[PDB]
Amino acid sequence: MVLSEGEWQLVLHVWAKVEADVAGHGQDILIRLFKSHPETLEKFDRFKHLKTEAEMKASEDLKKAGVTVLTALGAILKKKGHHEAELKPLAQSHATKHKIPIKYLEFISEAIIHVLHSRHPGNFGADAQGAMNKALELFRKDIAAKYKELGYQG
Ligand code: HEM
């Protein structure tokens, strides 16, 4: 997977919109993930018992998780694929400690796209959607390779 400078600039332009409200994007993205793929909520011992969207929006623990994933992913995207140093410790923790299947990184990727389109449709058109899909596929491909280096095929 390879992105053009142009495709990287589309990614960073929409990420600028995420950064106008990091915590609120984090909430929307994790709630979409948990509503669309409930099994993923079981991975978060601090908030796996939340059953409603209102309880999810009121949760400090969920809000903090949302900021964690979006600050990390923003930093990775700003590397424009030169993200070996960021992905190594992410693969280590998500493969060996959190036990997150590659399939769940595919789910949260879909949740990111869904929220970007829901919140920013005047801006997140077909070119932005294509470029972001390419950037999240590169992320998936590279972290999947790291998982295999650690002895996890999925
Ligand atoms: C774009 C995808 C993701 C990124 C960038 C990301 C990033 C992070 C970071 C930076 C941390 C804290 C440092 C660390 O433990 O490595 C973390 C913790 C964690 N992540 Fe993720 N993550 C992602 C996807 C997921 C998914 C899909 C799940 C579960 C379905 C997950 C579960 C967790 C858990 C359980 C922790 C531990 C949280 C805690 O200590 O309270 N992550 N993630």
69 lines ligand 1 (CB under 6 A): yes
Alpha-carbon 96 to chain mean position: 19
> Contact at 8 Å (CB) between 135 and 77?
yes
**Residue with structure tokens 């929006």?**
57
CA distance 28 to 32: 6
Output the CA 119–ligand 1 centroid distance in Å: 23
Kindly state the tokens that stand for 14. 């929409």
How far is CA 38 from each of CA 31, 32, 49, 145, rounded to the nearest angstrom?
10, 10, 11, 26
State the virtual CA torsion across 116, 122, 123, 129 in degrees, nearest 10.
50
Residue type, 131: A
Output the CA 56–ligand 1 centroid distance in Å: 17
Measuring CA to CA, which residue among 64, 81, 109 is closest to residue 12?
81
Helices and strands (H and E) in the chain: how many = 7, 0
Task: List the residue whose alpha carbon is closest to atom 21 of ligand 1.
Answer: 69
- DSSP per residue over 128-140, as a string? HHHHHHHHHHHHH
Kindly state the tokens that stand for 32. 């979409």
Measuring CA to CA, which residue among 88, 111, 29, 92 is closest to residue 63?
29
CATH architecture classification, 1-154? Orthogonal Bundle (1.10)
Task: Residue 153: count other Cβ atoms within 10 Å of its Cβ.
Answer: 7
CA distance 11 to 74: 10
Write down the domain spans for the chain. 1-154
Residue type, 72: A
| Helix axis angle, 5-19 to 22-36, nearest 10° | 100
Task: Identify the H or E element spanning 91.
Answer: helix 84-96
> Residue 29, SS3?
helix
CA distance 134 to 136: 6
Q: Phi first, then psi: what are they for 142, rounded to 5°?
A: -70, -40
In Å, what resolution does this model reach?
1.8
